[PDB]
Amino acid sequence: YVPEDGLTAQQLFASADGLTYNDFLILPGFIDFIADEVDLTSALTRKITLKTPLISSPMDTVTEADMAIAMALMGGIGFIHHNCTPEFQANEVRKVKKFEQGFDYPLASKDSQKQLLCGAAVGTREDDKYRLDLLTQAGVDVIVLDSSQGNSVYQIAMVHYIKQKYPHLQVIGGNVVTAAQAKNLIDAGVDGLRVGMGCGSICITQEVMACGRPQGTAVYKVAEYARRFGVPIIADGGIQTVGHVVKALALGASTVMMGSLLAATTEAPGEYFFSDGVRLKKYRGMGSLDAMEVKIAQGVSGSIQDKGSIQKFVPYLIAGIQHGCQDIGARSLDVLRSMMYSGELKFEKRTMSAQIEGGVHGLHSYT
Amino acid sequence: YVPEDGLTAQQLFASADGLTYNDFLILPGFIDFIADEVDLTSALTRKITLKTPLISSPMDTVTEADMAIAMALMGGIGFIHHNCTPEFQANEVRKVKKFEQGFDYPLASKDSQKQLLCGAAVGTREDDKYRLDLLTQAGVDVIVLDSSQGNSVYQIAMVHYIKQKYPHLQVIGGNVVTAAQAKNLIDAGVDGLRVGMGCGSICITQEVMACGRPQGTAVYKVAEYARRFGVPIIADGGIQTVGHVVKALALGASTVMMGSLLAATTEAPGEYFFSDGVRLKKYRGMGSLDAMEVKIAQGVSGSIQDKGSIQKFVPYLIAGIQHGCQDIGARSLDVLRSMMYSGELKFEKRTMSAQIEGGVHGLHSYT
Amino acid sequence: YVPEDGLTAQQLFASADGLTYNDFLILPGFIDFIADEVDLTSALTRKITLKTPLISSPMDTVTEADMAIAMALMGGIGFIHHNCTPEFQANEVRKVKKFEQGFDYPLASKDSQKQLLCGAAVGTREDDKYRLDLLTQAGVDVIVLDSSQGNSVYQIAMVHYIKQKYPHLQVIGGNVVTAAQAKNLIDAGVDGLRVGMGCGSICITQEVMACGRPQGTAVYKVAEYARRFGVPIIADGGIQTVGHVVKALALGASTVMMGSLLAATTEAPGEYFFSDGVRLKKYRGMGSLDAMEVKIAQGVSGSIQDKGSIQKFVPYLIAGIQHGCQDIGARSLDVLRSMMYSGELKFEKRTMSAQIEGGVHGLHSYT
Amino acid sequence: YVPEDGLTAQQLFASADGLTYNDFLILPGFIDFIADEVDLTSALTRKITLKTPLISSPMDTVTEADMAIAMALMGGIGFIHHNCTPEFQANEVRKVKKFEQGFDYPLASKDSQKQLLCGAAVGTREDDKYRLDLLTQAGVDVIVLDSSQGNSVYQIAMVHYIKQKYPHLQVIGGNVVTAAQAKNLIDAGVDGLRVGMGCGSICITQEVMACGRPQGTAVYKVAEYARRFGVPIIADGGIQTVGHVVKALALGASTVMMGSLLAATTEAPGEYFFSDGVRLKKYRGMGSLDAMEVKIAQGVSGSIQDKGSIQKFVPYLIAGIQHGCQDIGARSLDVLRSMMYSGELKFEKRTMSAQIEGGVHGLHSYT
Numbered sequence A, B, C, D: 001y002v003p004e005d006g007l008t009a010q011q012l013f014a015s016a017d018g019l020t021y022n023d024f025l026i027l028p029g030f031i032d033f034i035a036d037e038v039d040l041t042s043a044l045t046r047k048i049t050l051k052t053p054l055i056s057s058p059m060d061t062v063t064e065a066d067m068a069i070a071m072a073l074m075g076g077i078g079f080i081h082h083n084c085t086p087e088f089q090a091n092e093v094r095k096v097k098k099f100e101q102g103f104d105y106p107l108a109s110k111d112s113q114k115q116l117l118c119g120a121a122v123g124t125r126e127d128d129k130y131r132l133d134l135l136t137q138a139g140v141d142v143i144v145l146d147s148s149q150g151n152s153v154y155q156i157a158m159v160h161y162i163k164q165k166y167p168h169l170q171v172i173g174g175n176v177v178t179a180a181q182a183k184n185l186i187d188a189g190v191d192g193l194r195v196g197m198g199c200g201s202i203c204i205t206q207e208v209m210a211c212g213r214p215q216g217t218a219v220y221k222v223a224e225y226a227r228r229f230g231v232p233i234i235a236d237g238g239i240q241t242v243g244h245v246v247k248a249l250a251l252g253a254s255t256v257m258m259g260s261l262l263a264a265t266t267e268a269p270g271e272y273f274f275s276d277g278v279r280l281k282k283y284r285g286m287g288s289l290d291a292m293e294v295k296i297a298q299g300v301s302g303s304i305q306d307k308g309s310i311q312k313f314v315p316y317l318i319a320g321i322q323h324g325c326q327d328i329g330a331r332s333l334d335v336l337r338s339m340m341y342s343g344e345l346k347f348e349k350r351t352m353s354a355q356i357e358g359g360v361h362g363l364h365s366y367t
């Protein structure tokens, strides 16, 4: 007999401290398989499944056609940003949809016609209807309603309109952090939910508006509620490391969306420049004054260091996730989440001293 | 009559905050002996006892033959690293085993033939069997199975193989942080356990894989479980100070293993170099890309400032431990641990403000 | 009717978090007197009362005869350090005892013969008996047994010896942080207690030996126990501000001892020097290698910025204490402590965010 | 070393469950004296001390002159009831004051003239002033203001009047169960307090008026507050056993007042009668309709079984108290209370199952 060690997820979130990724760890389990055996199949919506849980964010410094093609080939997907004209966006979607490899990718995301999957973002205003018919003529597969606070009559009306006019189109609902928000969007009829508010690397929404939630708590609560109706959720924002990806998936998320991790890659839109002897690319929030152009800024504009190509960077992330799952003792992401919900998966909190101990420390210097 | 002050260890760990060394202190007791009377005899395995609780880590920038000889003479032991050919490792072990002082050390670690004790690390792959054969012909005394997560079918199979083929060899099992992990390795038949995951100074395992545990909690829990079967545990990683050594021993550990504290000594492998006007030596994790050579890095590579010789540095550590035990009121490490388990030893938590108050503060400058 | 706000001291310390001065505040009360009316009379020992609660520390960079004379004139007292020959120490005490003002100070500390009060420190070894003989012929008024851990057979034996040979001499017992330590020294027969271990500005005892206690908790617990026997306690170490003085007095201390606050004044021993364009004086712990001269260092050696004269600095401290007492609504320190013990005085905890809010913030620059 | 067992009184009352005598026990201590050595000296008021803690209640079926003489001879005291004419009451007091033994009692309660001590009860109306002067002419020693709720302007005015006109007379203030009630009466100037409301054996005040407090909690809280001003308190009502007496004294009471325990003794007023083959005496509350004669009844009227003489019954109670103190390890009642306040005395709660286990159980029959 062995006494139990650590906390279940339900106990971990019972004290209501406002935890996020860096505040806890996952305890190791039992290893009886190799890391290359770990299955990463994940549900994007009610009806779309991917071989990898990685999604590119619809930001104008992250995802255009080249990014989307690379993500689809690597086994994820990309959502084209809509900070542009509808004709431009539809042309980007068409470029993705008509790509042909030579004119090996065993994990590529494909539709029935064997074309690459693609997604796009739209707003909740009247002209977005015209945007929408253009995008559907270009052959989009899935739509995300792009908003900081999706629990509104505007977004609900847009969801109803889409469901009426295109009964085949998959729709992902706007950003939520509570079950009460999730309920209205699920009743309106969304096939997926985007979770997170204020946690993004370029975000200042929390400081400016006082509204948001710690991302780990938000992911756990919303996923726990949404699984009751078979609705998968995307964990969006605040991902800085492979460990963060693993933690988000273990807390209930089906997929993970990244802006800053994938910025400054070759496929990202924009030009490379130099400063202080380092190669850089621009990365900015959609709510920064540069992107929008009295108007209130909800994001900043900055730069990221070059990371190389997506087709090199993504396999590193996949291998990291598989090794994390092996250390946990889970041979697939479905098994990981079922162990979490049954209480078999165990967690531990970290003090600030523990977090310092977890990083590099006590060295004169290092690279 | 006096009311009780402070917390017992069991109460200290009851709230499950995820404590490590810097998060608490030990309250003083009653002094009726001098510091030079404090006995530091400690059990390395079921059948090997040392006169000092200090062990050198099997890393390729820490322990080769010179380090191992120095540690054995000072009253500890060293484990030769296996990031090298089996012939090279066996030659290192032979060099340690055939050393003769002149061809005083009252605390030296010796075997029956009166030769210095030595240890070595091996992996869990097929060629490690041949490594084992060579090391056993060189006369090793104890083996550590070297792994980040020892609770696996591979390590269990290797333990069974070693027990079958060399019934006399002492084996220390791979790194664990939970009682459930400890149970499988103890059932397989290990004579000792290495405890710690993610806490090392050169480690990034926690950030990359999301898996680990705060080291103080891990030491307390695993030692409390393992004492039931008479299995001693080594506290491995995260030791930066003599106070950390004392805390680890008071929490239940029998010995303490150090990588970075003993790096940049004369006996450490490698060459001294200069930079920015300071003499330095390389110190790197075994999971860094330099050591291993898609592959995922689990450690970094850095440098440490010169510390002088082991035969000067270790007596400083011994005297520090003895003075800590005197302030606690414990005349031996066995007495210290029995006071801990009986509840006589008392602890107190530290806020961050308390930790700041505990260090140097309020000075213009100091050296 | 008004509901109660805040915590009593007993509730504040019930959760056992390990609080220091910076972790809490005192809530304001009702003002019906001016700040100049606040009485600061305080008990140094069972039989010595001072008009001010301020004491100079027996360190070789803080208190010699000039410091002691200034402190006595301002209404406190100084303890001569014993890092010197007994003849030198006795000469210092004689210089203090024979001082005559002109060869106004309404608060000066005097004895029956109308000479200034003086104190001295001694150790617990055999030659300290001869030191004691010389100091008593020089006319000392009070002795502090100087040790990091006073709960020992050595200190108890020295207390018994002093009580037997000089039944008139007042003795203050070595540094303690628990009631169990306090009990033995009180049974041996001390007239006062020095409280604090590891909290001093130049101290590294906690990091090196793992032994100590947060100073606010230590003061509250030891004073609560010691008042039962009519033994006053000195709060020693970790005082950086007037607010810290006020907090220590409100938690139960009768007097406060300062090393670093009074260092780099004109009366402090040593010479002024310049570096980087600032005038400085040396300030070092008695356990640093410079002071002691294998030996283990328990303190560091540094420098402090010039503060001017004691006869200017101390009145600033007195006025600060009086204004704090006025804001609290206490017209004397005895009344302050009685309000604390009755539960009328109320406290509140501070998060780290609250502590940041409490300091200077949100400025481009300031002086 | 031994861990602490049980709860201190402060911890016992921290959960606010509303405990009374039967809800807890006292844990045994260490015996190093015989039961006959136990000192039972107790303070009745600021200025009257008795050799025994037992008081007779001022009820018209309990205390008249014969009861008062017997109690004084046995070492307690009796308060004459005032449900009668002032001339009758004064005659009773005169009878007590002029008694002479023969016209051995080593514990008898005496005044300076060597006459037996006596007490009397008065109300808070205008004619009570005339009652009071008559009683003072008869030579009363102490007065209790007799009321169910003493925290009123009427009782405060009567206390002021008594203090003005008879500065030598000791006054005990009306029944209270809270510190807020106690404060007003202490400010008015009482020398003692009567504690208890609704707990008496013949009382229905709680059922009729919804106002009261469990007696054990009331005794602890009021005594803890009143000791700060040197005011002793009487525990009044709800005493059925010697164990209850011991518990009340251990919780802080200085004396204990009994109505029903002393009813149906030879000295009690009234006539013996028979019914159903048992000898009985009447015992009724002062608030029952029979005693008062729309009027609301606050007590009932009943009967008690004959107990014999006071001079036999009281020594049994004294011996029981002494044996309880011996089992506790307290050689006097002052020592018992000091052990309680220091935390050395330890208590334990009882479930209902534990209370059943504590009585007689599992027998066919018994006598």
Ligand SMILES: NC(=O)c1ccc[n+]([C@@H]2O[C@H](COP(=O)([O-])OP(=O)(O)OC[C@H]3O[C@@H](n4cnc5c(N)ncnc54)[C@H](O)[C@@H]3O)[C@@H](O)[C@H]2O)c1
Pocket: A123, A124, A125, A126, A146, A147, A148, A149, A152, A154, A175, A196, A197, A198, A199, A200, A203, A205, A285, A286, A287, A298
């Ligand atoms: N996830 C986050 O925390 C976060 C925070 C800030 C910004 N962002 C991103 O930046 C961009 C800005 O988002 P946003 O919320 O400011 O844009 P939005 O268009 O959703 O909201 C702007 C404002 O217009 C209002 N509005 C929207 N549709 C309306 C309609 N049909 N009729 C009337 N009023 C209407 C909204 O209620 C809101 O006050 C998006 O790409 C968003 O995803 C995200």
Ligand SMILES: NC(=O)c1ccc[n+]([C@@H]2O[C@H](COP(=O)([O-])OP(=O)(O)OC[C@H]3O[C@@H](n4cnc5c(N)ncnc54)[C@H](O)[C@@H]3O)[C@@H](O)[C@H]2O)c1
Pocket: A031, A034, A035, A326, B123, B124, B125, B126, B146, B147, B148, B149, B152, B154, B175, B196, B197, B198, B199, B203, B205, B285, B286, B287, B298
């Ligand atoms: N203590 C720590 O937290 C920590 C963390 C990282 C690395 N390290 C150290 O760095 C080095 C690297 O350790 P590691 O765990 O990466 O090495 P490892 O060889 O134990 O593990 C590497 C991978 O190979 C697999 N593997 C091992 N033996 C196998 C077998 N027989 N058949 C199939 N698969 C097998 C493992 O399951 C794992 O996925 C070691 O020296 C280790 O001690 C320590």
Ligand SMILES: NC(=O)c1ccc[n+]([C@@H]2O[C@H](COP(=O)([O-])OP(=O)(O)OC[C@H]3O[C@@H](n4cnc5c(N)ncnc54)[C@H](O)[C@@H]3O)[C@@H](O)[C@H]2O)c1
Pocket: B031, B034, B035, B326, C123, C124, C125, C126, C146, C147, C148, C149, C152, C154, C175, C196, C197, C198, C199, C203, C205, C285, C286, C287, C298
């Ligand atoms: N308050 C603090 O936290 C703190 C910490 C470190 C140093 N200090 C100060 O620095 C100085 C050094 O203090 P310390 O405790 O190192 O000095 P100490 O002389 O009290 O202790 C030194 C060592 O000698 C031992 N010792 C003392 N008297 C002895 C005797 N008669 N026989 C045998 N052994 C004996 C002690 O037990 C201890 O191991 C003092 O001035 C002290 O106040 C204070």
Ligand SMILES: NC(=O)c1ccc[n+]([C@@H]2O[C@H](COP(=O)([O-])OP(=O)(O)OC[C@H]3O[C@@H](n4cnc5c(N)ncnc54)[C@H](O)[C@@H]3O)[C@@H](O)[C@H]2O)c1
Pocket: D123, D124, D125, D126, D146, D147, D148, D149, D152, D154, D175, D196, D197, D198, D199, D200, D203, D205, D285, D286, D287, D298
């Ligand atoms: N201890 C108990 O729980 C308890 C309960 C009920 C009765 N008793 C006893 O029974 C008897 C009845 O007590 P009681 O409280 O009913 O009697 P009381 O005379 O104290 O009170 C009767 C009523 O008269 C009022 N009153 C008293 N003095 C007054 C004044 N000067 N002017 C105006 N109003 C005035 C009171 O406020 C109350 O409403 C007493 O002997 C008492 O000790 C005790």
Ligand SMILES: O=c1[nH]cnc2c1ncn2[C@@H]1O[C@H](COP(=O)(O)O)[C@@H](O)[C@H]1O
Pocket: A057, A058, A059, A196, A198, A199, A200, A201, A202, A203, A204, A205, A236, A237, A238, A239, A257, A258, A259, A260, A261, A284, A285, A286, A287, A288, A298, A299, A300
């Ligand atoms: O301007 C902005 N203000 C606040 N949040 C934004 C903004 N732009 C994008 N976001 C969110 O931040 C996410 C990316 O955050 P990151 O991965 O942490 O860089 C996006 O997917 C959006 O949900």
Ligand SMILES: O=c1[nH]cnc2c1ncn2[C@@H]1O[C@H](COP(=O)(O)O)[C@@H](O)[C@H]1O
Pocket: B057, B058, B059, B196, B198, B199, B200, B201, B202, B203, B204, B205, B236, B237, B238, B239, B257, B258, B259, B260, B261, B284, B285, B286, B287, B288, B298, B299, B300
């Ligand atoms: O590359 C690595 N990644 C993570 N942990 C390592 C690595 N190499 C060694 N370790 C562990 O870290 C310990 C030393 O840590 P340190 O004493 O804190 O420097 C070793 O004994 C190993 O257990």
Ligand SMILES: O=c1[nH]cnc2c1ncn2[C@@H]1O[C@H](COP(=O)(O)O)[C@@H](O)[C@H]1O
Pocket: C057, C058, C059, C196, C198, C199, C200, C201, C202, C203, C204, C205, C236, C237, C238, C239, C257, C258, C259, C260, C261, C284, C285, C286, C287, C288, C298, C299, C300
């Ligand atoms: O060398 C040392 N090591 C640790 N504590 C010391 C040392 N020297 C003095 N102290 C303590 O520190 C106090 C002064 O601390 P400060 O006021 O915070 O500067 C003294 O009164 C001593 O109790």
Ligand SMILES: O=c1[nH]cnc2c1ncn2[C@@H]1O[C@H](COP(=O)(O)O)[C@@H](O)[C@H]1O
Pocket: D057, D058, D059, D196, D198, D199, D200, D201, D202, D203, D204, D205, D236, D237, D238, D239, D257, D258, D259, D260, D261, D284, D285, D286, D287, D288, D298, D299, D300
């Ligand atoms: O009529 C009444 N109603 C309520 N309480 C009474 C009454 N008469 C006396 N008491 C109280 O009950 C106490 C006696 O209670 P007993 O010892 O439990 O019988 C007296 O000392 C009074 O405080």
